[PDB]
Amino acid sequence: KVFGRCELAAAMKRHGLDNYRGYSLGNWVCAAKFESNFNTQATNRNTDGSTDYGILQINSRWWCNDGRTPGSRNLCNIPCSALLSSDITASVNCAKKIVSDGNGMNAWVAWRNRCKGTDVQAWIRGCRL
Template identity: 55%
Template structure:
């Protein structure tokens, strides 16, 4: 019994924090899911957005007392418009998903919903963090790593891992 409690105390923080992506890992997943150029936005724009919205954390949440909504997941998708958390008053659920689905390590549903959001009239400007930290700035550093690091490079929009040659 004591062993189970100890294991629970060791592993519970890992579950609560979710997956925190590395920049290149996130860029690779986003590229594989068609985000490079989607809605006229570069891969670097999406990685910059995720940095400033959630610090690349899939379990990030942020409560908004004004409209009693919550932002969920790596893209901080809002429960008032885009997902259903069962507690936000007058929620629209435009993406047709549970907000819990935005808190998993598999971000495919978050990507699908983000694609739906940018098809709206505001596009990527719907995200305040993108407007405040990414818009009008050189965001290329979000998808570039040092060749010597051995992690990854983006050359001509191609994911490249030096050790996989």
């Protein structure tokens, strides 16, 4: 599913991401835009052989099991395919674990390079939330 901007913002609010660990909703919408273009089906392979999955591009080396990333961890205890669903629950629940692991949203490269230090509020402007 390809979300609209305000549709995704509302879904992330419903799932508890607004101000989660101090990150306002716009941060999460901005990260999703540049990680996946709001497409839950997005996948991208990394040089080390791991793969990133879903709307927030969660990596199989640490967070999910895809059956082809040797020695990796499954810290979210889920198959990576669950992160491609039109229902974002599994992606949100795993993202909450990631953002709590000490490095905050710096775990998402696109957030650090394209959202951090910008007016992220703009990503939720106009939306009914």
